[PDB]
Enzyme design. Structure first.
Site, PDB file in Angstrom:
ATOM      1  N   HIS A 185      20.028 -11.685 -51.151  1.00 30.66           N
ATOM      2  CA  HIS A 185      19.138 -12.814 -51.037  1.00 30.66           C
ATOM      3  C   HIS A 185      17.732 -12.628 -51.471  1.00 30.66           C
ATOM      4  CE1 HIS A 185      22.271 -15.297 -48.625  1.00 30.66           C
ATOM      5  NE2 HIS A 185      22.555 -15.219 -49.916  1.00 30.66           N
TER       6      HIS A 185
ATOM      7  N   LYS B 273      33.130 -25.206 -55.508  1.00 31.04           N
ATOM      8  CA  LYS B 273      33.715 -24.273 -56.479  1.00 31.04           C
ATOM      9  C   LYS B 273      34.341 -23.078 -55.718  1.00 31.04           C
ATOM     10  CE  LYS B 273      32.185 -21.265 -60.561  1.00 31.04           C
ATOM     11  NZ  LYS B 273      31.517 -20.173 -59.640  1.00 31.04           N
ATOM     12  N   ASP B 274      33.769 -22.729 -54.549  1.00 27.66           N
ATOM     13  CA  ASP B 274      34.318 -21.624 -53.729  1.00 27.66           C
ATOM     14  C   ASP B 274      35.567 -22.109 -53.018  1.00 27.66           C
ATOM     15  OD1 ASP B 274      32.266 -19.986 -54.426  1.00 27.66           O
ATOM     16  OD2 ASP B 274      31.380 -19.858 -52.435  1.00 27.66           O
TER      17      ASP B 274
ATOM     18  N   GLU C 131      49.635   3.629 -52.254  1.00 26.35           N
ATOM     19  CA  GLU C 131      49.753   2.227 -52.479  1.00 26.35           C
ATOM     20  C   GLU C 131      49.037   2.075 -53.841  1.00 26.35           C
ATOM     21  OE1 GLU C 131      52.227   0.745 -50.433  1.00 26.35           O
ATOM     22  OE2 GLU C 131      50.830  -0.910 -50.767  1.00 26.35           O
TER      23      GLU C 131
ATOM     24  N   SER D 106      21.401 -14.684 -57.177  1.00 23.69           N
ATOM     25  CA  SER D 106      22.445 -14.180 -58.054  1.00 23.69           C
ATOM     26  C   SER D 106      22.035 -13.928 -59.500  1.00 23.69           C
ATOM     27  CB  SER D 106      23.653 -15.133 -58.031  1.00 23.69           C
ATOM     28  OG  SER D 106      24.485 -14.901 -56.898  1.00 23.69           O
TER      29      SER D 106
END
Ligand code: HEM
Ligand code: HEM
Ligand SMILES: COC1=C(OC)C(=O)C(C/C=C(/C)CCC=C(C)C)=C(C)C1=O
Ligand SMILES: COC1=C(OC)C(=O)C(C/C=C(\C)CCC=C(C)C)=C(C)C1=O
Lengths: 75, 105, 61, 49, 53, 378
Positions: free
Chosen positions: F200, F226-227, F270, F204
């Site tokens: 923050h 969009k998320d 895995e 971004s």
């Protein structure tokens, strides 16, 4: 932090917008749409594709050598 | 001067075209990563260049958003590509380096 | 040998935080041992029921 | 048991090849398999430990 | 490009902080030793021979 | 004044998901942050419901896992959502790190470094997870792994025995792993908040790597939805996996109860550790193998120091793009090799791929940046 009104200085830029209820969500979707994806593809194949085929090839060869190796003729 | 220089010049022109900032009307200096030296050079720009630089970045971010690109005629042509930031950046670095020399003694 | 005493401790070891730390760490090491044995012996005296009896059974191994 | 280049032992986890004495010959294993403390109490018996 | 920190002042700086960086390491060592009961290192100390042999 | 803006609690929400100035041009690739958020909660929720029936004792561990799938109402989906969610968590994790690398996002040092801690933590978390059913692969996986630590000089034997709670992977070891697998995801969350805290300070990055202060939009209609659309896509992938192919990414052997005498010919992790596994066994050394195993992950902390380009993103850098894609392609090779026996072809290709991984990140990618700068006369 951040906020709006304290980001940066901008001058002489107009922005025309239109309400979402007055325009279509999918304008020329197939018309302008598909050409764009092909163009985006052209732009990137030569950078994305090659590394991968090099692996594809190393994978199939790698498997063949291994399986063919556990067999034997004379001696 | 001759064959060789043009060949390095055409390789540079080739990279430029491949780099593709031109397609979003950007100039090379609009793509520079912003560290302190750069942040200061941006600050030192005159009113006109500063305003032009914001419009270019805005034009590109907008294009980049809808993943479109400019018509070919509006791409910035290599070497018509004004490196407006360079002289400012150079001086800011030169200033920092002098501070740095003084800090050694 | 009294006013000058805590004065020397401060002069030679407490002034710098370097020595201050080094001294409490060197001081934690010795203290641990002295407190442990010293307290074991106090726990030892008020009792005499546990392994004081050991002298008997064992040895015959 | 009975796997590997040396006709002794083979450890499948990272490719450790051992011989019939338990010695490391190939792979990243640092030492030979540990030989336990043992003795023979007769021709048919062995006490390990 | 770490040639920024190469000069007489930095060389003077380093020296002024050595007794301190050295004494901090003595703290760290004894501190490590006393906290894990470092057999190897401890057995040499006169008192603190609470491991007899 | 408003209510959102002023209330101590709502402020935090507002400043993080409502009025947060976000770049107008971030693409899918930026969705993996919220998707990791969803995967974290999904792992915790199905993880809790499983803990309401699971037993941490070797006597009933496997049985309790079986008890869940046959007897517990809808116990099976919960169990497969958990299992497959762990894989979804790694696909998202890998997209996320890669996105950061391509785009130069790592220049946010604290955010990224915190991200490395987050990677390690979910890795340590998932490893302990897989041991819980006490299958053959759980036990031998637990064995092969922990024992690596015995290569550390002078301290290694005591260290391995300390975390084992014995001389083997036994009773003490399973219960132990339960407890740590329960507490780890909560700690992860506190760290994910610190991750978001540092993020923050700048906001971004975006595809161009160029600053976006000039064109920010509220997170409030644009990135919430969009998320949302993106989480729905995560659900599809997860559900497609669990309601149609729940064992596809799973090993059919972890279905046979642990047997400390039966070593399967198999023995592999895995899938999400296969690349690191391949790097590990490429080295004919106990110490070096684990030293390089570690270094294949901790190298992400060296990345920002090896940035050499004058531009931040790779969008405008072709040579660098090729090298990046060769890194991803090299990581397919590594996982593929890691899932294969250490016999013919496989040894030398997996050996060279390991060298390539480190030649690429440590030498090739930086060199490309210098060349690119030069071509641009910078
Ligand atoms: C529990 C694991 C993680 C969670 C929950 C998490 C969450 C997020 C969120 C919500 C964002 C903002 C949206 C986005 O760009 O995706 C983000 C961005 C970022 N994360 Fe993570 N992430 C995690 C693991 C990582 C990892 C493994 C790294 C790399 C070491 C990483 C480094 C970054 C960086 C550098 C950004 C900034 C990207 C940019 O703005 O372009 N984080 N993360
Ligand atoms: C604190 C929240 C979590 C709890 C309470 C929890 C609890 C459990 C329990 C009781 C098991 C054994 C039951 C079973 O095997 O199905 C298990 C297995 C596992 N969990 Fe978690 N876990 C949590 C978060 C995680 C996280 C963060 C991961 C990492 C993505 C994770 C990945 C695994 C894996 C890989 C397994 C073994 C594979 C399998 O499902 O059989 N879980 N967990
Ligand atoms: C037995 O099967 C195996 C696994 O499944 C249980 C693994 O998970 C891994 C790799 C695991 C980790 C945690 C490597 C990271 C180490 C550090 C210091 C970051 C290997 C090699 C393996 O062989
Ligand atoms: C502007 O860039 C950003 C986005 O767009 C790419 C996001 O989508 C998110 C989404 C983050 C969420 C929903 C929080 C999840 C964290 C936890 C611990 C549950 C953030 C923070 C962000 O900064």
């Amino acid at each position: 932090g951040r906020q709006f009104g304290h980001l940066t200085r901008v001058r002489h830029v107009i922005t025309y917008s239109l309400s979402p209820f007055e325009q279509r969500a999918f304008p020329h979707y197939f018309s302008k749409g598909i050409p764009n994806v092909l163009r985006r593809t052209r732009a990137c194949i030569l950078r994305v594709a090659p590394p991968f085929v090099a692996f594809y090839l190393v994978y199939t060869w790698g498997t063949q050598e291994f399986e063919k190796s556990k067999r034997k003729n004379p001696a | 001067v001759s064959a060789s220089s043009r060949w390095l010049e055409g390789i540079r022109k080739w990279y430029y075209n491949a780099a593709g900032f031109n397609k979003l009307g950007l100039m090379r200096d609009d793509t520079i990563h912003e560290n302190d030296d750069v942040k200061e050079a941006i600050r030192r720009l005159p009113e006109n260049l500063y305003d032009d630089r914001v419009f270019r970045i805005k034009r590109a971010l907008d294009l980049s958003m809808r993943q479109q690109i400019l018509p070919k005629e509006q791409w910035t042509k290599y070497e018509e590509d004004k490196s407006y930031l360079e002289p400012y950046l150079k001086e800011v670095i030169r200033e920092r380096k002098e501070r740095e020399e003084w800090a050694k003694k | 040998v009294a006013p000058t005493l805590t004065a020397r401790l401060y002069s030679l070891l407490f002034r710098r935080t370097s020595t201050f730390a080094l001294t409490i760490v060197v001081g934690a090491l010795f203290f641990e041992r002295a407190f442990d044995q010293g307290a074991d012996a106090i726990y030892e005296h008020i009792n005499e029921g546990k392994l004081w009896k050991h002298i008997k059974h064992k040895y015959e191994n | 048991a009975n796997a590997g280049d040396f006709g002794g032992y083979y450890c499948p986890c990272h490719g450790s090849h051992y011989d019939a004495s338990g010695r490391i010959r190939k792979g990243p294993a640092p030492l030979n398999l540990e030989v336990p403390s043992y003795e023979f109490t007769s021709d048919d018996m062995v006490i390990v430990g | 490009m770490l040639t920024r920190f190469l000069g007489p002042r930095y060389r003077q700086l380093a020296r002024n902080w050595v007794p301190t960086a050295q004494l901090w390491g003595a703290v760290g060592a004894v501190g490590l030793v006393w906290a894990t009961d470092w057999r190897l290192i401890l057995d040499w100390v006169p008192y603190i021979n609470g491991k007899f042999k | 004044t408003n209510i959102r803006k002023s209330h101590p609690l709502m402020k935090i929400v507002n400043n993080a998901f409502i009025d947060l100035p976000a770049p107008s041009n971030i693409s899918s690739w930026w969705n993996f942050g919220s998707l990791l958020g969803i995967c974290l909660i999904l792992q915790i929720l199905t993880g809790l419901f499983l803990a309401m029936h699971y037993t941490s004792d070797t006597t009933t561990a496997f049985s309790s896992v079986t008890h869940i799938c046959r007897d517990v109402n809808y116990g099976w989906i919960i169990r497969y959502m958990h299992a497959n969610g762990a894989s979804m968590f790694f696909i998202c994790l890998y997209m996320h790190v890669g996105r950061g690398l391509y785009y130069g996002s790592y220049t946010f040092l604290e955010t990224w470094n915190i991200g490395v801690i987050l990677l390690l933590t979910v890795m340590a978390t998932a490893f302990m997870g897989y041991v819980l059913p006490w299958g053959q692969m759980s036990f031998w996986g637990a064995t092969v792994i922990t024992n690596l630590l015995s290569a550390i000089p002078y301290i290694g034997t005591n260290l391995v025995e300390w975390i084992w709670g014995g001389f083997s992977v036994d009773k003490a070891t399973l219960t132990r792993f339960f407890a740590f697998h329960f507490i780890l995801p909560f700690i992860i969350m506190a760290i994910a908040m610190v991750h978001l805290l540092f993020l923050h300070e700048t906001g971004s990055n975006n595809p161009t790597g160029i600053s976006s202060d000039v064109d920010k939009i509220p997170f409030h209609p644009y990135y919430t939805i969009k998320d949302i659309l993106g989480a729905l896509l995560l659900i599809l992938a997860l559900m497609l996996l669990v309601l149609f192919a729940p064992d596809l990414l799973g090993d059919p052997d972890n279905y046979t109860p642990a047997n400390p005498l039966n070593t399967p010919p198999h023995i592999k992790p895995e899938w999400y550790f296969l690349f690191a596994y391949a790097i590990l066994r490429s080295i004919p050394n106990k110490l070096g193998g684990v030293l390089a195993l570690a270094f294949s992950i901790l190298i992400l902390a060296l990345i920002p120091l090896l940035h050499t380009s004058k531009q931040r993103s790779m969008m405008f850098r072709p040579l660098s793009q090729c090298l990046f894609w060769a890194l991803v392609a090299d990581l397919l090779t590594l996982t593929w090799i890691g899932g294969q026996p250490v016999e013919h072809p496989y040894i030398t290709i997996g050996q060279l791929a390991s060298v390539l991984y480190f030649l690429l990140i440590l030498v090739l990618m930086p060199t490309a940046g210098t060349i690119e700068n030069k071509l641009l006369k910078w």
